Structures are given as C-alpha cells and as structure tokens.
C-alpha cells in the first residue's frame, strides 16, 4: 500500500514520468477519406495507444495492489475515456482540430466521412475548447486520467481505490495551491476539471455505441483485443 | 482474454 | 443577474423550496417498461417547472434550457431514484407503490444491468451518508453541466455551477469537516456525477431498443426527450 | 413544434 505514502510531489514526478508517448497513425495520403479509411486509421491507432495504455496503468500507484479481476475491469470500462481525454488534451494547441496523432489533424468536415462521427467530432471539439479557456496544465491532465482509470468501474478493496482517489485529489489541490489559487478558486478549479469527467464519460459512451454500430456495418475488421474490450461494455 | 495477459507481462 | 448574489444559505432554500413532488405509479416485460415510463413521463412536467427554480437557469435562452434538459433529463430521474432509494437498501423506489428489487428487473432484457448500477450507485450515497442540501446541489449541477459544453451565456452557467461549488463547500464547512475533507469529500461527490451520466447513457440505449423492439409505446415528449440523443 | 419548447414557455 506504498502509493499511500507518496507526497503530493512524488505522485506528479510519478505520473509524468509514465506518460505514453504519441503514437503516429498509417495515414496514407495517397488515399481519399472514404468512411473504411477512417475508421480504419482511428481503430489502428487506437490498437496501438492501447498497448502503451496497459503498461501505462501498471504504473499509476495503487493500481498493481489490486487483482488481476480488478484491474481488468477497470481497463475496460475506462479504455476509450483513457484515450479521448488524451486526444483532446493533444488538441488544445489546434482549435477547431482534432489532433489523432502528428500525421493525423481532422477537423469536423471530415467526421463527414462517417455517419454519427461529427457528433462526436463536436463534443471532442468542445472538451478540447473548455480544456484551452481554463488553460489545464500538464500535472493537472496526468491526475485527471489516473482518476478516469480508478474511478469509472470502482464496482478493502474498492476502499483502497477511494483511498488511491483521495490520494489524486489532494495532489490537484497542491497543485492549485501551488499556482497561487486562493482556498475558494482551488474548490471551484476542482469541481470545473472533475465535472469534465462527466462530459468524457458522455463521450466514450457515445463512442462506444459507434464503435459497435462499426462493426455491425462491417465497416473495418477490429483487432482481437478491440473486439475484447467492445464485448466487455456488453455482458 | 487477451487484456489479462498483457497485464500480466 | 440575482442568482450570483444569493449567499450559500438562500441557495439551499431555493434549492429545497424548488423540489419537486413525489409521484405514484399508475407483469410482463412490456407493463414493466410501461410503468417506468409513464412514471418518467409524468416526473418531466414537474421537472420543467423545477427547473426554471433552478438560480440562473431563468437566465438563460429559451433553446438553451431545451438543450439542457434534452441533455439531462434521464440524469436528472434516476439521480432522484438514487436519492428516494436510499434508505431502501436493495430496492429502488420508482415511488411510494413502486418499490423493485433486482429481481423484478429481470423481467425486461438488459434491464438488471442497469437496476444493478441504480443499486450501487444508492449504497454509494448511502456509505457516504449524502445529505439533502448536498443532493439538491448535486442535481442541479447535472441540469447546468451535462449539456454546458457541447453549446458569454456558458460563462453564466459557469458562474453559476461555481456558486454551487461555494455552496456544497460551505454546507460541508458548517457541517464540521475538516478543510481536506471537504476537498475530498466534494471530489467523491462530484465522481459520482460520472456514474449517473454512465446510467443515463445505459438507460437511454436500453429505452431507445425498447422502442425500436416495439416493447412500449411512448409518449410524444418522451420520443423526442430521446431523438436529441441520436 | 418541440413539446419541451412549448412546456418550458408555461
Ligand atoms: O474516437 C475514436 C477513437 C480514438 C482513437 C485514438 C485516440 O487517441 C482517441 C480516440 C478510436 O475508435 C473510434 C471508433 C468509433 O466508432 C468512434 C470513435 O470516436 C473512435
Ligand atoms: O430508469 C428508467 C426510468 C425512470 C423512471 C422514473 C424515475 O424517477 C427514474 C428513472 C424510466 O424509463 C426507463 C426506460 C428504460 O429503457 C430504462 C430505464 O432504466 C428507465
């Protein structure tokens, strides 16, 4: 139980230095967006970030103390949430855009390509925009998605987890202390990320639902552990 | 399930 | 706009003075599932008029309020069912003649699922003992927030759900906890939040294959409470 | 039009 003993500093060092990397994507140019392409290059990438997602995970303290079961569950119920709030954190510098990786910059017209996308092009959109008018810092972003992974399936043990919980919010708090934000701006700084959570929450729902519609349609074959992780947000 | 082994590597 | 200088006090009467009323119901998979919705239907006029109690929300335009409660809606009923249910450990309470346990879910397809989440989602409440003014101010976070985003009128609307960050501080500061708790605290509550937009979402695409089944017939307002998801 | 709409102008 040694994640509970990590100051507020240590946690930050901790989760910044596990972050993943950015991934390119397969774009080929030589290659009009058609909506197989697209779906295509965003489920390839995805496949690839989840990879880098797992090993990531095993790093946020106080996620091994749990068993393998748990663990599991916790991966697939925050996989996509994981990876929006990546993407839209990669975005902040590009209003308007959508930056999947450094060779990959959609923008809304191209959410075009594929039936139901653009609503979810916009919502992405939006959370990139809420994300830049607050000017969301790098330790803020990291502490963010360790609480994503803890908390979207915490269903002892689930107290250890809200133990871990406790252990995030207290270091968003430095953090804001530490920017010289007074008691009353630190609540309300707090409650502005984490009712963020909900809207990305929204928004992996959202995605998921395409997803699955996806592979109805047979729009593109998904890999064997994307086909895990989609049969695992049904039964 | 393909998850619970790469968690276990 | 009257709303900002409301103290935290007279946040919480208006909040508690706004409540709406507790409504009655009125067994096969489809007189299940004409139940709940019957119910939902009948909770949304009174959650209209709750809503324009709401400090701030007068304020806003009139398709701005639409797509607000067009968002929240299904957030907004099951985080009161929570609330009901929670001294009724096991069973959720649709109403006072409408009290269901997870047995009686399994009557519906897909239906378990979800009373399994509305259930641990009531427990959660209950370990951590939420309070009334606390629920009040957590509802109507949900009814600002959930469709804020995907919109100087959000400014209102942020200033507004700052407020009720104040005021969800203060209850907890004249309640006794300590100034750490009180962070941790309203973090635990607002997580939970997530939770209930995971539910409304579960329960949106279960009610949407209700209706695409044919199970149910839907009300008008409740076919278009759900065309605003899809 | 929307029934919303139109209950919210009550
Ligand atoms: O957004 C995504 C992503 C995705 C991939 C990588 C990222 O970094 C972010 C999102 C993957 O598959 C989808 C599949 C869908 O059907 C809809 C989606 O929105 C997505
Ligand atoms: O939970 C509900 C409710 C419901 C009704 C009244 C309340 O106070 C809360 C939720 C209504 O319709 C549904 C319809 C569904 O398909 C699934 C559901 O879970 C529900």
């Not at chain 1, 240590?10 to 950015?22: F, G, K, T, Y």
């Not at chain 1, 959570?197 to 996806?214: F, V």
Request: net charge negative.
């Amino acid at each position: 139980s040694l994640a509970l003993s990590l100051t507020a500093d240590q946690m930050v060092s901790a989760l910044l230095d596990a972050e993943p990397p950015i991934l390119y994507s397969e774009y080929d140019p030589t290659r009009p967006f058609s909506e197989a392409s697209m779906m295509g290059l965003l489920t390839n990438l995805a496949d690839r970030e989840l990879v880098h997602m797992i090993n990531w995970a095993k790093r946020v303290p106080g996620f091994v103390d749990l068993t393998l079961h748990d663990q599991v569950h916790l991966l697939e119920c925050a996989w996509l949430e994981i990876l929006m709030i990546g993407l839209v954190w990669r975005s902040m510098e590009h209003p308007g855009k959508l930056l999947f990786a450094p060779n990959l910059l959609l923008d809304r017209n191209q959410g075009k390509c594929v039936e139901g996308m653009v609503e979810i092009f916009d919502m992405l959109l939006a959370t990139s925009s809420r994300f830049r008018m607050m000017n969301l810092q790098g330790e803020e972003f990291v502490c963010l998605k360790s609480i994503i992974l803890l908390n979207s399936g915490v269903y002892e043990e689930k107290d250890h987890i809200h133990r871990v919980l406790d252990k995030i919010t207290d270091t968003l708090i430095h953090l804001m202390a530490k920017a010289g934000l007074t008691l009353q701006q630190q609540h309300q700084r707090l409650a502005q990320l984490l009712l963020i959570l909900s809207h990305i929450r929204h928004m992996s729902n959202k995605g998921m639902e395409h997803l699955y519609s996806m592979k109805c349609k047979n729009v593109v074959p998904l890999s064997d552990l994307l086909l895990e992780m989609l049969d695992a947000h049904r039964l | 399930k393909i998850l619970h082994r790469l968690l276990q590597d």
